[PDB]
Structures are given as structure tokens and as C-alpha cells.
Swiss-Prot record, chains A, C:
GO terms for cellular component: cytoplasm; cytosol; extracellular region; extracellular space; nucleolus; nucleoplasm; nucleus; perinuclear region of cytoplasm. Homodimer. Part of a copper-dependent multiprotein complex containing S100A13, FGF1 and SYT1. Interacts with FGF1 and SYT1. Interacts with IL1A. Expressed in heart and skeletal muscle. It holds the Pfam family S_100. GO terms for biological process: mast cell degranulation; positive regulation of canonical NF-kappaB signal transduction; positive regulation of cytokine production; positive regulation of interleukin-1 alpha production; protein transport. Ca(2+) 2 binds at residues 64, 66, 68, 70, 75. Its main location: cytoplasm. InterPro entries: EF-hand-dom_pair, S100_Ca-bd_sub. It comes from Homo sapiens. This is Protein S100-A13. SMART domains: S_100.
From Swiss-Prot, chains B, D:
Ca(2+) 1 binds at residues 33, 39, 91-93. GO terms for biological process: calcium-dependent activation of synaptic vesicle fusion; cell differentiation; cellular response to calcium ion; chemical synaptic transmission; detection of calcium ion; fast, calcium ion-dependent exocytosis of neurotransmitter; membraneless organelle assembly; neurotransmitter secretion. The gene is SYT1. The modification Phosphotyrosine is found at residue 90. It is found in: Cytoplasmic vesicle, Secretory vesicle membrane; Cytoplasmic vesicle, Secretory vesicle, Synaptic vesicle membrane; Cytoplasmic vesicle, Secretory vesicle, Chromaffin granule membrane; Cytoplasm. It is linked to Baker-Gordon syndrome: An autosomal dominant neurodevelopmental disorder characterized by infantile hypotonia, congenital ophthalmic abnormalities, involuntary and hyperkinetic movements, stereotypic behavior, poor or absent speech, EEG abnormalities, and global developmental delay varying in severity from moderate to profound. Behavioral characteristics include sleep disturbance and episodic agitation. One of its GO terms (molecular function) is phosphatidylserine binding. Ca(2+) 3 binds at residues 93, 96-97, 99. This is Synaptotagmin-1.
């Protein structure tokens, strides 16, 4: 029937893309994440994995390789990469935990 | 109350009429930022005087900052009798409502400006 | 060790970790992707997303910067990062950085 | 094993005493190179005879190459009985080290040369 499920990974990427697309259409250019859009994502649906709302630009300027204030699909995915790392690495120096 | 120890050296200037507050380092600082770390930056405050307010560089992710910032205690030596400087260390975890993890105060009336006041003052966690 | 209930984004990136723990437990250690498990992973779970299921040895060598034939919980995630861009790019990669 | 299908037409030549191997094309080829477009070409291989070897044209980024290359099976038709030929397809992205994806074999000893041998031979994978 209609609405048939896809492969595990295909379903997983569809979910994140859906959330990515909804936030990539807040300011403009539904494909990239602007300053407010990028911050709106973390300061709403990600206050646990990464607790930082005061130095968001610190992340943007460390992920954007072109520095145009608009995190493209590739640049935005860079956040997800480090996010998945921060769940296993965290602060492997003093305290990590989960 | 415990916040560690702060090594500092105070010298007086008679040309600009102020006390040179130069701190060396602070150790045994408590952690605030999740992960056993903190962003402790000392900011000097005063009593009703309020003729001075300087914040040091944000020492992000550290428990022992070594920068040796210079604070200009803009107040005539003649007004040191009724002037008590307080050094409060603030955290900057950049998420939670970080506050004063500790502070220290010294009555300049008791302290003489004969030469230099170099010592290792103990810090206390005087929460607000 | 293990994680407790998280949010949408966190769980969306955790679900891929579950796949890892189930695949990396055939050869040895549930925290290291071996060679057989890697081959059975791409030639079963990622045969469509990943167009290369033959030169896996090339991928393995490019991911394992340790060259010890042990994809730890870090180097293995690089594969997920590559297949993630395989939906936007196709041959616009590889290059050579020394 | 599955490698697709190969269409070809074989004919014999008695003036030079050899078999003219003319392949039309190969379809349903598996993916090997990134992007889903491998660079596969066919390389003729023989049994201990090894009195023949030819490399075809490299067809880059295609899982359905149509060139119709010609191979000269230099060997008397009388020796076709003890002459088993195999056709292996190799891909080369010019970067990764991979092997033959698949191949097909035909026993000439069981194939008479009355006129021509045209058929849609099945392609099967053959890990080396």
C-alpha cells in the first residue's frame, strides 16, 4: 500500500532532513541555515547534547568554511557530525558521562 | 567557603593616583560548565564608590587561568581609607545562569601603600 | 556505556549507533568494526546508498587512519559522514590531502 | 551470481584459422566505482594455451557499454576442442584497487562452427 517504509538509514536521514528543512525556511533560502535559523535549532531542540546559547557564533565560525552567515547543507551536516561525537567523547579530560 | 588561592601583587602609583591591581593566577577553582570545567573570569566591583568596573578576559574552559590582567583602581591614595575593593570571579559556561562562584575583599584602610602588597590571598565561595 | 531517553535529533543520530552495536559484535568486541562486519554491513545495509561495495578495502584504509584494521568508535563514523554526502555529491570527492 | 547479460555474435574464419569474437554489448552491470558508474571493459583470457590476449577500449562511467570490439582468437579451429576461452570484465576508476566483477566461459568443444554463434549469454560474478 501507499506510504511504505524505506530502509533503516533512509528513514533516519529523512527524519533529520525534515527537521533541517523546517528550520531552513525561517529566514530565507530553504537549503541553508541562516544565523537565527541555526541558533533557533539548538536553542529549542538541542539543549542537552550541547549546552551553549551564549556563544553560538563560536560554532558557526568553526563550521562555516565560506563564512557567509548561511550554513549550507554540507556545512550544517558538520554540526550533526560533531554532535554524534559529543555523545561519546563529550569532555574526555575530566568528566564525560552521558 | 572555598574557592582556592589567588596569587597577586599590588603596587601604588602616585602619578595617576591609583592602585595597580595585578593578579597572577588562581587555582582550585570549582567547575560549572558540564564536564568538569568552567569559564572563570574575574571582575572587580566596589562599594557605593562605583568609580571603577573592569572585567578580565573570558578564560573559557580552565581551572587555573594565567593571564595577569591589569586593573586600574581609579581612586586617590587619600581615599583608600574608605575604599574596599572586592574581586568576584564569574563563570561563563554560556548556557546556564552562571553566577559568582567566589570572591574576596580587602580593606585598603588597613593595608599600607608603603611599597607593594604581594601575597597569596585565599578565596571563598561567597555565593549571591 | 549506554544512553537514556533523548530528544528527536539525539535519538535520530543514536539509531545509527544501534546498527553499529549489532553489526560490530560478530568478529570481536562490540565497540570495534572489524573487516567481515564492515563488508557485510555495506553489502547488505548500504548497497544502494553506497555505490561501492567492491573497493571496500579502499574505504576501510581511508577510514582507518591507524591502519591497524580496527575501526574504533570514531574512525567508523567517518563512513556515515561520507554516505551522508552521497545523496548530494557523487564523484565530487576523494582528491588527495597529505 | 549475477553480472548481467552479454550480447555477442561469434563467427569462424578459415583463411587465417581463428575465431572472430565480436561482442555487441553488456547490460545489467553491477556498481563498483563511486557514484554508481564504473569503468568496465572486457579482457580476453584463455586456458594454459595463453596464445592470445587483448585489452578492449576503456568504457568509463557506464553500466551498459556499446562499442562492439573485435578480438582475434589466433588458434586453428581444429584445436577448438581443447581451447576453452573466458571473457572477464574489469573496471578501473584509476584510483582504487579492485578485481574482476564477473566473467563467462564457453567450451568450444561443445560448440560447433557450422555458421555463427549468436546468443544472449548470461553474465555471472566471479570473485578472483
Amino acid at each position: 500500500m501507499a506510504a511504505e517504509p524505506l530502509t533503516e538509514l533512509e528513514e533516519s536521514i529523512e527524519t533529520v532532513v525534515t527537521t533541517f528543512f523546517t528550520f531552513a525556511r525561517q529566514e530565507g533560502r530553504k537549503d541553508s541555515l541562516s544565523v537565527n535559523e541555526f541558533k533557533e535549532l539548538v536553542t529549542q531542540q538541542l539543549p542537552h547534547l550541547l549546552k551553549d546559547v551564549g556563544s553560538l557564533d563560536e560554532k558557526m565560525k568553526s563550521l562555516d568554511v565560506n563564512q557567509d552567515s548561511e550554513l549550507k547543507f554540507n556545512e550544517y551536516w558538520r554540526l550533526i557530525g560533531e554532535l554524534a561525537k559529543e555523545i561519546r567523547k563529550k569532555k574526555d579530560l575530566k568528566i564525560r558521562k552521558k | 567557603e572555598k574557592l582556592g588561592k589567588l596569587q597577586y601583587s599590588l603596587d601604588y602609583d602616585f602619578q595617576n593616583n591609583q592602585l595597580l591591581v595585578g593578579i597572577i593566577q588562581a587555582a582550585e577553582l570549582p567547575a560549572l560548565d558540564m564536564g568538569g570545567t568552567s569559564d572563570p573570569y574575574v571582575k572587580v566591583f566596589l562599594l557605593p564608590d562605583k568609580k571603577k568596573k573592569f572585567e578580565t578576559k573570558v578564560h573559557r574552559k580552565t581551572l587555573n587561568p594565567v593571564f595577569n590582567e591589569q586593573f586600574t583602581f581609579k581612586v586617590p591614595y587619600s581615599e583608600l581609607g574608605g575604599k574596599t575593593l572586592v574581586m568576584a570571579v564569574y563563570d561563563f559556561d554560556r548556557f546556564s545562569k552562571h553566577d559568582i562562584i567566589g570572591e574576596f575583599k580587602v580593606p585598603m584602610n588597613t593595608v599600607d601603600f608603603g611599597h607593594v602588597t604581594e601575597e597569596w590571598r585565599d578565596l571563598q565561595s561567597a555565593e549571591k
